[PDB]
Design a protein around this ligand. Structure first.
Ligand SMILES: Nc1ncnc2c1ncn2[C@@H]1O[C@H](COP(=O)(O)OP(=O)(O)O)[C@@H](O)[C@H]1O
Ligand SMILES: Nc1ncnc2c1ncn2[C@@H]1O[C@H](COP(=O)(O)OP(=O)(O)O)[C@@H](O)[C@H]1O
Ligand SMILES: [Mg+2]
Ligand SMILES: [Mg+2]
Lengths: 77, 76, 31, 523, 98, 107, 31
């Protein structure tokens, strides 16, 4: 329900919509996390690191976060 | 948002997950006594947090792999 | 206990980020 | 008057928007400089729209209000109130602005209680009289035993500079402010302490000069340093005199007589300099400009010549050397000369300044402020000016009170003790006067980030049973004794905060009609 | 060796000192990720006169290349910049003067 | 008046979620004050019809019908009393006609 | 004693005279 005419921030709108369409609980936390990954990449951008090299480093880092999250998980419904 | 300090609270919870095996250790607003999320019954879905890390990484990859903006000026 | 809570609902938390972002543009101009 | 309006472009309001615009415009002034009160309050940066904006950062409440240009009519009373506070005592301009705004904020709470506004004026006059006796009975005098008075003066400068940009420089700038007024040894003229601002270096590199600094360096072919000299200053014309006869021409018959007149003009200019060197001097300071013909005469005799220092530059040299102005040279036995040891030139920030090292009867100082930017030097000059003006009046009035919130709780206790001995018509207005006095330690406590709801509650419980010296400790965030920590303020500074805010809140509360006229060239 | 909130700011002070070798390595066409990392490895061993060699295109001895900087240049660049940034976080309120 | 007191808690640096959690416990205690002080009316219908005129007398006192409580209370109590069932609030058709005073109105 | 004081600093004391002066113009128009 915003009038943001910015094509980068429009992708944050579709990110919160895609979390609502698939799961529907973490639409707020998926925007703070995406803004946190881009804020930490700002200091890495000034050090001469390539932006695709940061993007290739995030895929190898997010793969560890998926496998570690599946350690303790149980329900008896 | 709970009124605490971000350094004084995140350093204590993260240090307790290394000295022992990593528990369900988070925070809360009224804090409910201890910081154990298993005792406070703060339960979230696995596929909810799995898609939070997966979708935010792919959206960052599409806004890091861009080096040109071709927007127009005025409307007419 | 939490031993207090200091609610800071005022202006200059946002203006302090404006002075930082303005000085970063000067350091990147003559970098 | 709104119904069937008989005005051209002027508007007015009576008792509905009159007190509404007066309470909005006065609280927003006090809420503006609310963040600059206390030893942990932030500062403001003032900017214009353009056309030589000349940004000037200030923490003092008088310099903020004198440059904003408020369009509100009732807000200009609080702007003019802080202007008199800077001109009389030089401190508490921020404290008198928040206190006058908290009185009208408590008076806005008496709008819905249907209290008559003349009852609040009569209730605050009895509250101000009870608050004068709280500061007068708690004032600490200092007569003899001067080793305790010099320690008391460092607590005054340490309290004033703690609320400014000179936070972690109290080990140096307190000695630069106490010893500057201590070298006056007389009246607080507040102009013998000439502050020179030079770029380059930190604030710790600043110092108090033992002599005196000046500009307009010594001639062309004159000596730069003379040991054990006799300084004679002047305020007379050297060349191109045109001496005091308007309507006098040189009407001759031939051009050979013009060469005799212009040689006679240079002989009288030479004879004037010959009357100066009969005193036996080595340095010469003229307020006016010195041209080339007397400059060659001082250079041939080995005499310095400082031309066009300042109009107030010869006044500071007369107080630092012990001489006189001596604008007429016809009696060498009635002209007292100055005394010095070294007139060497020093270089401060790639600029050669004339250093009058080793002067006798030096009742003048020179503070060499060095800072990182020009914005720091403009702030440190006003921060030192807010510290030298209090010490110039502390030596005239040695009565001091315990600051840091201790003086405000003593004033609020005397009002609350007499609010219970009054009938209920004026007792509600006296309780609002005591609540506004407790807001002044609440703004100081909340600016640091402490629990202001509990620290002022601990101050009110302490002052209710003894503890006349208990105040707010901003170092650790607790309640401590103000006589041990050494946080004191002057009596005349704290009296002018109480008295001028009570008089300014009396004017705005008595306004029921704001009739503004039609402005010119505003369409 | 410090603790509390002071230990997180000296690390922020030390990480801001690595910008000038990151600036010098990026302007020289070298990789600034491995240049500042190799410079911290040489100074940890004891090489106090190590730096960026723009002629060889790497890290070598500075006094061999005759690169001499005075002490008053680098001390006043650290003293005046720290005194400036200690005031910008204290001076923060926008007041537009009319 | 709740938000006016919440504006007074701006300068006291109180967290706004503490005011929400403080008012939820305050509203829960305020429900018990009205529930324990409520006066019920079952049988003895001659006191319930007197109680109904006190409800209409309190509601019409804050309106334009100030000096008409001797008439308009009987026009409001007996209108609902003639329903003898559900409060449909549409069988009471109000017809507004000009002419005459408010005392000339009738059921 | 004065037995109280009721300060009424509000709007509609002046609007009440506006309804009076407007109704006087109607009665004087058809007078
Ligand atoms: N009792 C609690 N203690 C600690 N944290 C909690 C508690 N309840 C909720 N949270 C946190 O609040 C967050 C709320 O996220 P939310 O905004 O609902 O995400 P989304 O926008 O995707 O629905 C969750 O990530 C959760 O960790
Ligand atoms: N060391 C200290 N301990 C406690 N309070 C202090 C200390 N130093 C200054 N203060 C308080 O900070 C306030 C600063 O007021 P200030 O803005 O200087 O007023 P003004 O603008 O009229 O000079 C003073 O009222 C004083 O009580
Ligand atoms: Mg002061
Ligand atoms: Mg009603």
């Amino acid at each position: 329900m915003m009038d943001v005419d910015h094509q980068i921030a429009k992708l944050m709108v579709e990110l919160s919509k895609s979390q609502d369409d698939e799961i529907g609980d973490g639409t707020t936390g998926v925007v703070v996390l995406a803004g946190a990954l881009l804020e930490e990449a700002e200091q890495l951008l000034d050090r001469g690191i390539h932006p695709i090299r940061i993007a290739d480093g995030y895929e190898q880092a997010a793969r560890v976060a998926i496998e570690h999250l599946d350690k303790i998980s149980d329900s008896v419904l | 948002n709970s009124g605490m300090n971000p350094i004084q609270t995140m350093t204590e919870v993260r240090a307790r997950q290394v000295k022992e095996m990593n528990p369900a250790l988070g925070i809360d607003c009224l804090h409910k006594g201890t910081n154990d999320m298993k005792q406070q019954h703060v339960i979230e879905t696995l596929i909810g947090k799995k898609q939070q890390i997966s979708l935010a990484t792919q959206m960052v990859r599409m806004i890091l792999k861009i080096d040109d903006i071709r927007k127009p000026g005025e409307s007419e | 206990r939490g031993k207090g809570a200091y609610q800071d609902r005022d202006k200059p938390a946002q203006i302090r980020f404006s002075n930082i972002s303005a000085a970063k543009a000067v350091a990147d101009a003559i970098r | 008057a709104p119904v069937n309006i008989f005005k051209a472009g002027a508007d007015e309001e009576r008792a509905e928007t009159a007190r509404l615009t007066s309470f909005i415009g006065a609280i927003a002034i006090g809420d503006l400089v609310k963040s600059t009160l206390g030893p942990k309050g932030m500062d403001k940066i003032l900017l214009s729209s353009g056309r030589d904006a000349s940004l000037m950062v200030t923490n003092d409440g008088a310099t903020i209000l004198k440059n904003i240009g408020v369009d509100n009519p009732a807000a200009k009373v609080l702007v003019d109130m802080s202007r008199v506070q800077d001109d009389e005592v030089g401190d508490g301009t921020t404290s008198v602005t928040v206190l006058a705004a908290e009185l009208l904020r408590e008076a806005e709470s008496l709008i819905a209680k249907k209290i008559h506004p003349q009852t609040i004026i009569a209730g605050w006059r009895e509250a101000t009289k009870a608050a004068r006796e709280a500061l007068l009975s708690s004032a600490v005098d200092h007569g003899s035993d001067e080793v305790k008075f010099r320690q008391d003066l460092m607590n005054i400068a340490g309290t004033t500079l703690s609320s400014k940009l000179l936070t972690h420089h109290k080990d140096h700038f307190t000695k630069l402010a106490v010893e500057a007024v201590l070298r006056l040894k007389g009246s607080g003229n507040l102009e013998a302490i000439h502050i020179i601002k030079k770029l380059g270096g930190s604030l710790a590199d600043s110092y108090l000069d033992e002599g005196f600094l000046l500009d307009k360096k010594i001639g062309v072919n004159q000596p730069k340093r003379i040991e054990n000299a006799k300084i004679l200053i002047a305020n007379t014309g050297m060349d191109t005199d045109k001496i005091k006869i308007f309507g006098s021409r040189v009407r001759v018959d031939s051009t050979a007589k013009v060469a005799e007149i212009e040689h006679a003009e240079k002989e009288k200019m030479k004879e004037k300099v010959e009357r100066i060197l009969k005193h036996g001097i080595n340095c010469f300071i003229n307020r006016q400009l010195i041209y080339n013909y007397p400059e060659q005469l001082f250079g041939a005799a080995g005499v310095m010549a400082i031309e066009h220092a300042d109009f107030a530059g010869v006044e500071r040299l007369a107080l630092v050397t012990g001489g006189e102005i001596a604008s007429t040279f016809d009696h060498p036995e009635l002209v007292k000369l100055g005394s010095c040891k070294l007139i060497e030139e020093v270089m401060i920030g790639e600029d050669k300044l004339i250093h009058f090292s080793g002067v006798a009867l030096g009742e003048a100082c020179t503070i060499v402020l060095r800072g990182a930017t020009q914005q720091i030097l403009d702030e440190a000059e006003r921060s030192l000016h807010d510290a030298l003006c209090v010490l110039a009046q502390t030596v005239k009035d040695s009565r001091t009170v315990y600051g840091g919130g201790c003086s405000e709780m003593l004033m609020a206790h005397a009002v609350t003790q007499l609010a219970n001995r009054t009938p209920g018509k004026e007792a509600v207005a006296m309780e609002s006067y005591a609540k506004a006095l407790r807001m002044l330690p609440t703004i100081i406590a909340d600016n640091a980030g402490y629990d202001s709801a509990d620290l002022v509650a601990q101050l009110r419980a302490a002052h209710s049973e003894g503890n006349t010296t208990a105040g707010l400790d901003m170092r650790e965030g607790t309640i401590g004794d103000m006589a041990i920590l050494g946080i004191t303020e002057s009596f005349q500074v704290k009296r002018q905060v109480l008295l001028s805010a009570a008089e300014a809140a009396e004017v705005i509360l008595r306004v029921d009609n704001i009739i503004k006229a039609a402005p010119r060239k505003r369409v | 060796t410090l603790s509390g909130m002071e230990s997180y700011c000296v690390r922020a002070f030390a990480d801001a000192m690595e910008v000038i070798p990151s600036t010098l390595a990026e302007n020289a066409g070298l990789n600034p990720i491995s240049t500042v990392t190799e410079l911290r490895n040489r100074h940890a061993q004891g090489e106090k006169t190590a730096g960026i060699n723009v002629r060889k295109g790497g890290i070598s001895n500075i006094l061999e290349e005759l690169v001499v900087q005075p002490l008053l240049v680098s001390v006043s660049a650290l003293t005046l910049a720290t005194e400036t940034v200690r005031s910008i976080l204290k001076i923060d309120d926008v007041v537009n003067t009319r």
